[PDB]
Amino acid sequence: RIPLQIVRAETELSAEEKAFVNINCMDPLGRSALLIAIENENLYVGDALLYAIRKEVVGAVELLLS
Amino acid sequence: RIPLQIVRAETELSAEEKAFVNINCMDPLGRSALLIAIENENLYVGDALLYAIRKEVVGAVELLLSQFSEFTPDITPIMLAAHTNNYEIIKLLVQKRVTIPRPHQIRCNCVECVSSSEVDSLRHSRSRLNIYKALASPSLIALSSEDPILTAFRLGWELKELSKVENEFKAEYEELSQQCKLFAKDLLDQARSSRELEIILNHRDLAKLKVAIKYHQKEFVAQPNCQQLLATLWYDGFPGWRRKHWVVKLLTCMTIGFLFPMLSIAYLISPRSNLGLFIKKPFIKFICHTASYLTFLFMLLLASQDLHVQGPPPTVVEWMILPWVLGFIWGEIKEMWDGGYIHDWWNLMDFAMNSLYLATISLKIMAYVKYNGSRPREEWEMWHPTLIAEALFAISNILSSLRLISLFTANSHLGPLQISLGRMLLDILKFLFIYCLVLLAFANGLNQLYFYYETRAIDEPNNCKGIRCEKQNNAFSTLFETLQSLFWSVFGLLNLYVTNVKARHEFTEFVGATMFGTYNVISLVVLLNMLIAMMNNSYQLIADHADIEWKFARTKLWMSYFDEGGTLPPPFNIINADSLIQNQHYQEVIRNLVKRYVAAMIRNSK
Amino acid sequence: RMLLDILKFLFIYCLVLLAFANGLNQLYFYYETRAIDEPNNCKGIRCEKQNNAFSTLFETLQSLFWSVFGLLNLYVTNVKARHEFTEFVGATMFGTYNVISLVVLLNMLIAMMNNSYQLIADHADIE
Amino acid sequence: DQARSSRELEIILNHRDLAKLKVAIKYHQKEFVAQPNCQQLLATLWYDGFPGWRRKHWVVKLLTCMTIGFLFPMLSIAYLISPRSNLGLFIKKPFIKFICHTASYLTFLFMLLL
Amino acid sequence: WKFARTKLWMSYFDEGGTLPPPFNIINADSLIQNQHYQEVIRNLVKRYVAAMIRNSK
Ligand SMILES: Cn1c(=O)n(CCCO)c(=O)c2c1nc(Oc1cccc(OC(F)(F)F)c1)n2Cc1ccc(Cl)cc1
Ligand SMILES: Cn1c(=O)n(CCCO)c(=O)c2c1nc(Oc1cccc(OC(F)(F)F)c1)n2Cc1ccc(Cl)cc1
């Protein structure tokens, strides 16, 4: 058989952080809090402006003044 | 009328359960309660996990902790999760202990590779195809693989070799192989710097590019960033050979061409000097190897500018060619010794043009001894050694200069042609197999009618017989002569009066002219327009991949001048301390590549 | 615009022409006669009876050019001191030249011009 | 396309001897025939005595085909003097019958060239 | 091509012309067989209808 197991596994620091302690909750896909609040138009930043410019303009005016 | 009535009707046990007693109420379409609660995400199970894995992941985590099926009795949850190619479901299922049955091998004849394909042979083939469709998943290779690039190479190879052995199902194995080949390339597209592009190509010297070449990964090679890296090792001493003008390129290439005996006398008397290192850069080595082959062919054109000697001594030019010939015979011994060889169609023209030179020297020596004196050439026998050596020399002079066509892949304009014209040749060779049947049939028919009227070489004017005469005669009197007569009529070089006979019989001459005419119709109006019709369709399907195949071929032409073995042209040819850090950096690069490729493929699923 | 893809095809045909001219002249230059030994005191392939077709390189190139159009007769393969092994080899080299040039390299040019003209007729009104 | 086993693929093709494949051929059902599972079943009746004639090399195929071609008058003299023997049954497999019929037609045309 | 090769194959399956031309001139089960076919057809039609209804997306 071919045993399948996750090679080069990720880190999963805590479980209380799974339901949003650290506010910079990087998920398996590297989606922090702001990335989820930008992908869903719910209105440390890093480069969250590039993720807003690439979808639409509602929060782009918000991240441009904060 | 046609009375319509439900044949092989189903059963409807109760009416109370029509509005949901039995909780396992199978509807007409075999949809139980859980199937309806899964298709509608409302949040005895049987195989309801396979119906959840195949749509989405909300309740898949729920069913993972708690007959008529639409799935074959061999599909495993992990196999179907790999068929669907969803990253989050395959991850959830691989966190636990799941396995996949390893397929034995292409040509397996063990106890169960024969006793399973002799019971069903349908379930076996289907199970094998489903296993290979699960293994060839870009998401099951991303996670659960030490290096996903070598696994993709091996899988593409195994699946390409399986579409040939498995005569049927040839359409699914090629799409699986093209799915692996497209995954191994879309992972190299995610390199952001050049420091992490030389880590991938040098893993375990471009030691991974060679493994890509030996697996025919034409898309991994020919990737823009992989070619922009090879073009810097090629022009090792020409920084910016792409900004120059075509005249400054031509006059700089010809300047290196006219200096090949000087750059080559160094590296023999100064292997570690300034001038001695200038013929180790691959581009200069190329220009010196192809300006040494143009001195061997310009010297073959001079061998025609004292002919009654039965066995003559070698001439000046035949003394000035022998080093080239010996170097070519030697340099082809090593290459077929450092390996197997016949897959390169240029190694047959190169193995036959060196046997003819051997047969030429083996016959001009036999004729130097054993032959003393000089009699007129007008009365030599036809099988005279001096007449056969001078024929083999010309037969090999043709092949020596037909070899300059392999040098076309190096050019951006004539390379894609030479590569696209050589792929239109494998469909000509199978068309020149249909024409042989027609040639042989009509030659049999035309010789069966004309062999009674065969005259002699003396009864004919100028004492000459055959079709290479000024007045062609005896065209269909022998089979070996009928075949040549019918070959030379494709080009219009056979005159019609060869249909007549002396004792003029006007019924057999007409039948013999009608057989020749129907041959002409079949070969020059039917079988010749069909060849154009096929070449038109075969060239349209080729011009799509014409730029990837050319780059794959030019990469192999480049990689042959990167080593040090055959550095010197044929005329002068005969005169674990780091193995873990090198393996640890590759794993970090692979981690980053897989992460950003997954991120780029999830977002793009819209 | 169909002419820039012909000029790069008339570069492949030059290699074939040169290779086969080299091969056909290496075999036939011993039997070069004079302009007087021949009828009507005339030598070459522009004669009524063509002769000395493969005796010079400059003459072999013209002989192989004029065979694309069928204007070179087959009896130019013979020689006076008839050697039936060299005449057959010289006829077989001429025959393989004819196959490569008139059945292979000439249908390929049509196959390319068909594909090059379909991609051109789209922009034919803007150009 | 929905047959899951080979036991229920020979029930369909043998209904009323491949008695339904012949009805498909006589109606020009070019897609019912040429279905991968219908051809994978015919390729095992064709190579009736060559289990795995698809794993072999092309040279081992050629030299095994010409070996049967050069034995067509011996395999055919049996089945006439031994119709129920070991060697007499070797020319009832369809592939060997084919190789013997096309190596007997190549002896009639080589005799016409003579 | 496969339709033509199938007809070329089916011509060597019988026993009539087994021997090449040179030597050429020298209801008990009919109801179970019909009942199994009906079950196979029932299953095929069921799963084809299922795979065709779902596929309409
Ligand atoms: C096969 N064939 C042939 O062999 N001969 C040689 C016999 C003389 O030696 C012929 O003259 C000959 C011939 N087919 C012939 O008619 C064709 C009709 C249509 C197409 C075609 O094909 C193509 F379009 F031309 F390519 C050919 N004709 C001409 C002919 C002669 C007499 C009579 Cl009554 C009627 C027609
Ligand atoms: C290259 N070549 C050649 O040069 N000569 C001249 C020699 C006489 O001087 C030939 O007669 C000659 C020849 N190829 C020949 O068979 C072909 C088969 C298939 C295609 C083809 O190509 C095309 F479809 F026709 F275009 C040619 N034949 C005919 C022949 C002659 C003797 C024998 Cl045993 C077998 C075949």
Numbering used by the authors:
A (entry chain D): 17 to 36, 61 to 83, 95 to 117
B (entry chain A): 17 to 36, 61 to 83, 95 to 117, 135 to 272, 286 to 386, 392 to 426, 430 to 664, 703 to 733
C (entry chain D): 512 to 638
D (entry chain B): 257 to 272, 286 to 383
E (entry chain B): 639 to 664, 703 to 733
Quote the study on this structure.
Transient Receptor Potential Canonical (TRPC) proteins form homo- or heterotetrameric, non-selective cation channels permeable by Na+ and Ca2+1–6. TRPC4 and TRPC5 are the most closely related TRPC proteins (70% sequence identity) and can form functional, homomeric TRPC4:C4 and TRPC5:C5 channels. The N terminus (residues 1–366) folds into 4 ankyrin repeats, a helical linker domain and the pre-S1-elbow domain. The first four trans-membrane helices fold into a voltage sensing-like domain (VSLD); the next two helices form the pore domain, together with the re-entrant pore helix (E3 loop), which lines the ion permeation pathway.
For our structural studies, we engineered a human TRPC5 construct containing an N-terminal maltose-binding protein (MBP), followed by a PreScission protease site (PreS) and a C-terminally truncated (Δ766–975) hTRPC5 (99% identical to the analogous mTRPC5 construct). The cryo-EM structure of a human TRPC5:C5 channel in the presence of Pico145 was determined with a global resolution of 3.0 Å using C4 symmetry. We found that Pico145 binds between the trans-membrane domains of two TRPC5 subunits, where it displaces a phospholipid in a conserved lipid-binding site. However, the shape of this density was strikingly different to that in the mTRPC5 and mTRPC4 apo structures: in our structure, no density was observed for one of the lipid tails, and additional density was found between residues Q573, F569 and L572. Although this density was not consistent with a bound lipid, its shape and size were consistent with the presence of a molecule of Pico145. Similar to the phospholipid in the mTRPC5 and mTRPC4 apo structure, Pico145 was observed between two TRPC5 monomers, with four molecules of Pico145 per TRPC5 tetramer. The 3-hydroxypropyl substituent on N-1 of Pico145 interacts with the side chains of W577 and Q573, apparently substituting for the phospholipid phosphate group in the apo structures. Pico145’s xanthine core π-stacks with F576, and several residues (including L521, Y524, C525 and V579) interact with the 3-(trifluoromethoxy)phenoxy substituent on C8 of Pico145. Pico145 also makes additional interactions with helix S6 of the monomer on the left (monomer 2; blue): Pico145 interacts with T603 and packs against G606, and several hydrophobic amino acids (V610 and V614) interact with Pico145’s 3-(trifluoromethoxy)phenoxy substituent. However, the quality of our map was such that additional residues could be built within the region 175–187, and that residues 172–174 could be placed with greater accuracy. This region showed that histidine 172 and cysteines 176, 178 and 181 all point towards a central density, consistent with metal ion binding (see below for details).
